[model samples]
Target: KDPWEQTLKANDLEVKIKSVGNPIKGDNTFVLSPTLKGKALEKAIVRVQFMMPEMPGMPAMKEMAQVSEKNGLYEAKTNLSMNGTWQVRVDIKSKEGEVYRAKTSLDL
Candidate 1:
């Protein structure tokens, strides 16, 4: 199957999440492609955070993914458990020390 793309915006930068395959209930690989003003961003840090919301009384689960650049795009292997929708937020820091954050969701 082809990789999937999820587009998100973080301030002046644009982030695209490209999964190697459909995210399942275990380890998932992703490519974090970021661009600024139509240019491929470089020397940036891409960190992904996931939170699985549950019933109010129950404690929620969280996961974090830190990525590095490969072929101009940041990539990481993030482990996920359970089959439901998870709120995904990414905080990226550019080489200039500027930071950006964006929110999205993933359903498996």
Candidate 2:
């Protein structure tokens, strides 16, 4: 089974994060879905940071999610070049000026 999955809460918003496929070396694509009480999220921005916390003073790799118009799902694709435990930080901003954040770790 896939290992990357999470459901987080920020105020009234419920944020969902999961991988579309296995994200091993050279693979980086995921989906982010946010909703609030069955209502579609609007005018939101999503960002993902691939952090190697085990490494000393290494900078976090970053990527911005592309949100779809048909659905509010955010899509992100970037380089996940390491094969070890890594931290993913998800940041979200809603149109109402509400900020949401979630963090999870996974092995590659």
Candidate 3:
């Protein structure tokens, strides 16, 4: 089972992340969603940054999330090449240029 959930706020928006399985040394998927004033947020661009804490000098793996317009949900997948402590950051930007960000860590 995946074991992380974090909610972050940016101005009027709220961003949440949910992991779909053990985010370990392989493919991992996560669902990210944004809400504004308790309603689903729409027309936003989502991006993710994966970084390994044990190897800070290594380049962070960046990915763009596929968003579902109808539900304001974003899905992203990334492969973790090795098992260790990892830092994950999520960024969401609206079409109007407003930005929201969240950070979390995972150990596998």
lDDT of each: 0.83, 0.72, 0.72
Question: Candidate 3: worst 10 consecutive residues by lDDT?
Answer: 61-70
Model 1 clashes, total count = 0
> Candidate 1 local accuracy as lDDT?
0.83
Work out the TM-score per prediction. Answer: 0.89, 0.78, 0.77
| Clashes per candidate (backbone, < 3 Å) | 0, 0, 0
Clash pairs detected, candidate 1: none
lDDT of 2 by residue, 56-105 (tens): 67765543434443368777676777788777777788877778887776
Task: Give the per-residue Cα lDDT of candidate 2 at 52.
Answer: 68
Predicted candidate 1: what Cα RMSD to the true structure?
1.6
Which model is ahead, 1 or 3, in terms of lDDT? 1
Which residue runs does candidate 2 get wrong by more than 4 Å?
1-3, 54-70
- In model 2, the worst 10-residue window by lDDT is 61-70
- Candidate 1 TM-score, C-alpha based: 0.89
Please provide, for model 1 over 1-108, each residue's C-alpha lDDT reduced to its tens digit, 9 standing for 90 to 100.
666678998888888898888777898888888898888888887788888867666667888875768965988777888888888888888888999999888887
RMSD of each: 1.6, 2.5, 2.6
